[PDB]
Amino acid sequence: QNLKSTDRAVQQMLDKAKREGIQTVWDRYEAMKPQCGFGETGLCCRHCLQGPCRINPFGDEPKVGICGATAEVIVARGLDRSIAAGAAGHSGHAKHLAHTLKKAVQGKAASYMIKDRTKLHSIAKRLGIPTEGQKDEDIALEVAKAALADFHEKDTPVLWVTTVLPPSRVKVLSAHGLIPAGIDHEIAEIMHRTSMGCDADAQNLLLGGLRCSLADLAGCYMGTDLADILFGTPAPVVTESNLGVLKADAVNVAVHGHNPVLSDIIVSVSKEMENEARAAGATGINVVGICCTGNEVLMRHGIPACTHSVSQEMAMITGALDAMILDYQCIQPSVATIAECTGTTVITTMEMSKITGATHVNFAEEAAVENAKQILRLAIDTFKRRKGKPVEIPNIKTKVVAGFSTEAIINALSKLNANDPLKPLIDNVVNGNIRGVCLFAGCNNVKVPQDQNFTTIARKLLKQNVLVVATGCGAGALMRHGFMDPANVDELCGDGLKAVLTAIGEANGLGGPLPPVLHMGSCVDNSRAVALVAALANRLGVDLDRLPVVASAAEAMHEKAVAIGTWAVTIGLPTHIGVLPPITGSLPVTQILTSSVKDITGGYFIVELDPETAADKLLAAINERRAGLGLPW
Amino acid sequence: QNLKSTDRAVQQMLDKAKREGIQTVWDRYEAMKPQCGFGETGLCCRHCLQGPCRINPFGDEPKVGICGATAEVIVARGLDRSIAAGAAGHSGHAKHLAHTLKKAVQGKAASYMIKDRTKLHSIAKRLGIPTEGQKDEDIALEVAKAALADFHEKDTPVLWVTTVLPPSRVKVLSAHGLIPAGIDHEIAEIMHRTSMGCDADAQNLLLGGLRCSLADLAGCYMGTDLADILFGTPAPVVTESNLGVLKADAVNVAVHGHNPVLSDIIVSVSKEMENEARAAGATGINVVGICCTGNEVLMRHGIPACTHSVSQEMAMITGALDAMILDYQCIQPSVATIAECTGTTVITTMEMSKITGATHVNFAEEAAVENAKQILRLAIDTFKRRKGKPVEIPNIKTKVVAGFSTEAIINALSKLNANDPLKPLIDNVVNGNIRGVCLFAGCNNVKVPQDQNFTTIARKLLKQNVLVVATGCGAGALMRHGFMDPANVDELCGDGLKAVLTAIGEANGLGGPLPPVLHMGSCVDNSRAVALVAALANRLGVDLDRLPVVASAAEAMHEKAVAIGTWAVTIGLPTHIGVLPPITGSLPVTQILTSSVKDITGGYFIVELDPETAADKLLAAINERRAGLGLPW
Numbered sequence A, B: 001q002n003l004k005s006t007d008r009a010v011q012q013m014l015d016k017a018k019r020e021g022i023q024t025v026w027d028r029y030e031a032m033k034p035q036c037g038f039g040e041t042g043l044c045c046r047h048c049l050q051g052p053c054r055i056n057p058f059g060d061e062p063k064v065g066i067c068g069a070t071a072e073v074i075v076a077r078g079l080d081r082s083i084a085a086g087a088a089g090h091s092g093h094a095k096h097l098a099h100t101l102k103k104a105v106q107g108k109a110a111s112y113m114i115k116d117r118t119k120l121h122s123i124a125k126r127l128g129i130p131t132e133g134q135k136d137e138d139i140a141l142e143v144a145k146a147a148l149a150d151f152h153e154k155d156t157p158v159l160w161v162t163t164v165l166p167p168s169r170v171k172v173l174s175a176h177g178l179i180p181a182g183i184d185h186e187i188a189e190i191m192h193r194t195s196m197g198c199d200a201d202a203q204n205l206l207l208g209g210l211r212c213s214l215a216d217l218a219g220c221y222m223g224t225d226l227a228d229i230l231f232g233t234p235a236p237v238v239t240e241s242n243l244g245v246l247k248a249d250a251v252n253v254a255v256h257g258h259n260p261v262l263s264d265i266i267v268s269v270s271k272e273m274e275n276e277a278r279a280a281g282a283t284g285i286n287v288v289g290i291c292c293t294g295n296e297v298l299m300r301h302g303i304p305a306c307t308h309s310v311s312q313e314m315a316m317i318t319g320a321l322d323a324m325i326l327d328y329q330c331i332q333p334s335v336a337t338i339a340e341c342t343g344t345t346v347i348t349t350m351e352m353s354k355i356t357g358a359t360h361v362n363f364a365e366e367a368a369v370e371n372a373k374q375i376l377r378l379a380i381d382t383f384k385r386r387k388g389k390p391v392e393i394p395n396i397k398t399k400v401v402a403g404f405s406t407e408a409i410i411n412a413l414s415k416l417n418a419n420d421p422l423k424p425l426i427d428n429v430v431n432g433n434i435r436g437v438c439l440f441a442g443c444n445n446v447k448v449p450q451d452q453n454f455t456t457i458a459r460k461l462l463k464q465n466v467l468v469v470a471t472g473c474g475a476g477a478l479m480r481h482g483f484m485d486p487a488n489v490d491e492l493c494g495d496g497l498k499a500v501l502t503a504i505g506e507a508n509g510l511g512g513p514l515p516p517v518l519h520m521g522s523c524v525d526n527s528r529a530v531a532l533v534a535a536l537a538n539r540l541g542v543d544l545d546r547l548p549v550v551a552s553a554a555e556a557m558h559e560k561a562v563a564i565g566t567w568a569v570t571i572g573l574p575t576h577i578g579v580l581p582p583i584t585g586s587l588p589v590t591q592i593l594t595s596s597v598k599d600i601t602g603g604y605f606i607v608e609l610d611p612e613t614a615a616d617k618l619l620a621a622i623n624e625r626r627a628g629l630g631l632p633w
Ligand code: SF4
Pocket: A045, A046, A047, A048, A049, A050, A051, A052, A053, A065, A066, A067, A068, A069, A074, A195, A196, A197
């Protein structure tokens, strides 16, 4: 089982699934091999009913699509549609939150409110919305209206791009025509230009993809902004992760998917329903997280993380998961079938994301507490049905310190320099105690032994004094392997990095260091890393493409991860991807994405499937940036 | 060559291409065989980087996608993305025209103007925009703003759906949640819900597809509306079609793609440049049409149609095509390479639709006449370069009567009944002189011998007294085979239909009948057929799903044709498709689309590749509708 996952809790549940005859994602992958080499390389097109078309990577015919589309075109069009799809998921998430904020301050959804007034005012200021002498509700209405307005063309470009990046970066992007006009506008334009008989120039197509990736960034940033207003900006919190956070004697409820509009209310209502749970013979309701919505409630409330991404089915295999409450994205639809075996009640809540065989309980923000209680009573009933059945919860968990929003990192740093909080971090980049910064992002992928790339690359970077931050299921991987426990600083960190983490933590009264890796939140909260990096660029008076900052989507899966990787490149970062995206069938497209885009945005992809080699390449990219700043390395 | 195309002009050029060693679309198709059976059946997914996934239609593993996606889900998701792509092309086209109208009436694009004031006022009235005591420019600004507003969520649904269908049809759709909230909103929601780990219920997915298809209808209707305001509503016109419309002694310029914003100006400027052409030794500039933009200028100005769809490369093979002026959609990118052999100057004009190797001359509506002159001087220069080279223009053309907008059909009918113009048509449906109405729509497809399905089905329906209307390259197929020449009424039409066409034509002073098939315009002008059918429904006091009206996408290719077929079903029509869409890998999805959708919208797909059998099935669908109205059949 170590060939499937490096997580021992997952390994134990894989053994249970095997002896019970429950098919898993790894089993479905084995049954798919060998995968199609046309799809793997990107040399397949189904954009019209003359298809399917393919192109042999090498050899004889077919060499070109039926309409004349070259390998360059076909590869670029497929990639662009993946970017648009990722941007779309983020569009739905951010729009969901904008409409919730609007309903809240209009009196239409009393379960929701302005929780972070300071965040609201700062966002208003950044956007140019007046606040002096205005009521909070009015300010919030204006911020929500501005959010919705960024989805379509208007007299300004997308403000959740142009107001979040330094002017010099906006200028570089503008000169290449890359600033998005509207989020859903760009998505639609990608779908148009990639349809048959439209754009058929690889460079042109890929420039369109870069612009659409900035529409994805806007959606991520908007999502973080609005979720902080509604639910609170994260601050440092302590919790636990891995399957051992499940409790046989409690009603175990996983929140899975993405939007805190749902999960945040599940958490608060679960506490209100403690005595009912107890009446049912449980100790209470134990809410646990899976995937990004789990990260959201981990970051804000310390809700323990059960599992992530590829291993999500394993929570069910314990026999103790009473309910799995879903909104959208990254949910293996297998969960609905596995539930029939395990007893778990799988509940969908959003009209556009249903799964055949799952119970659907519409969740309306207008009725959020009522709808949550209906959902949680299904969970309590399920708990009662497993009275006396043995369960197998691996007794495996890690300690996790998390909650490192950008505000929280700045506050922590301010204990070393009150009126110039970024300066202690920069001082230590300059003196070499901090070599650079690496953001780990994105998914696990069944092709890669689960977490192996994240932990292999992170260990090499930490020993080389890189400040490592993480989001999404990258953060999930690292937390499940102890990278968020300050007790592991001595083992994992280089001496320079250890000194910095210790100095910050001691200044924050911890008696101890910050954790080895800073958890910056969900996948939309990759936008928090952008805020931190943009703040550093502005403090230094340089653009992002001069900073010793890199990203790694070390085990990427979703279209959303493709979009995030692409905007990381577009804003100026060297960006590793540890799985093959479907580009290798076109050398000209690969050369664009890994080399000549440097001349456009300063960023570039690093495609490298071997994690030791990836770590070396990421260090070389950091050190090249250090040399460009005149720094030792 | 008759196995490739049933068009003798195309056959002649296929012989020329063969002896000159010029690869064609048919050659590229042969080189693609056998095509992938996973793609053909829809049983392939590339929606994440764990893919590509496939499912064996029959036999053993693989049976399910890696994430657990079933065949039902995979097929429905792929279909939905094709619908969204089609809607996107129509979004770009309609938005292009809305922005042009806005610029025109703001003084920013003087080459454009309100040409159809009556159309402007009628659209304003339909939308609920006041006109009394307003200036035209102000009314037009409001119509343009309303058009743009339909792309995003607002306080009303998409008005280019809800104001163009009868209230009872809107009510049926509303009850199923199918009215679109915004055009680009729906496109993005499709891309989201079809991304990994989101919607995974076939019925739910397909309902989303029906709603997105209505966003495509809205874009089509908006495109027709705005193009009529700007360029004039079509009225009956006489012209010619097929390759023989090219003239060796003229500068031959094809307009190809879709938007009349470009082609309409090319036509007017070409006339202004006649003496320059002559100075260059040509007789003048001979503008000819390809694909929908050709249909646009055919319908409004009588510009002759050179060719359509799959045979577009053959215009170049004559050696006489001096320029091919492109905007977007349905342009085989092979044209850029073939031009190197033939001498033709291929010119792109839109930032989102470039072709490697083609000359790009940006076209700005603000500078339309200047930009058109630059384009046309490239064409004149090309003419001069072929002085003394032999050309091979097949001396093959047909007469075409066209220009049958809905307004034009109503006006023609009003000569028989001035104050109840639809009544003569209904009278003849009732007495059986008109059995029903069939709309032919959509593309040619290289899999089908070009035009064979359109002409085979049309001949059977016309002998059975069906009133046949056509758009796009369906209209193209029929016009190239003589179905738009009134001289062929005796041969083609049943006696009842002949009597009706004769009576209308004689009442309109023609001395002769209307043509066998009524050309209702470009593919967006499928919306004109909707206007006619909705007007008939309202006059009769019934919904569209009770009328003896059908549609046939007899040789469909583009994603746009998939979208149009799907909204034809959604508004209540039996809708034939004569090529296999990638659905056969899921029986449950096929059963939805061909049978149980009848219980939702009253419409349904008829998938039938044999055209004689298709004609029988279309007649049975018409006759079932007649029986439901209590009529003989
Ligand atoms: S768009 Fe071109 S390459 Fe793609 S399926 Fe259609 S003919 Fe083939």
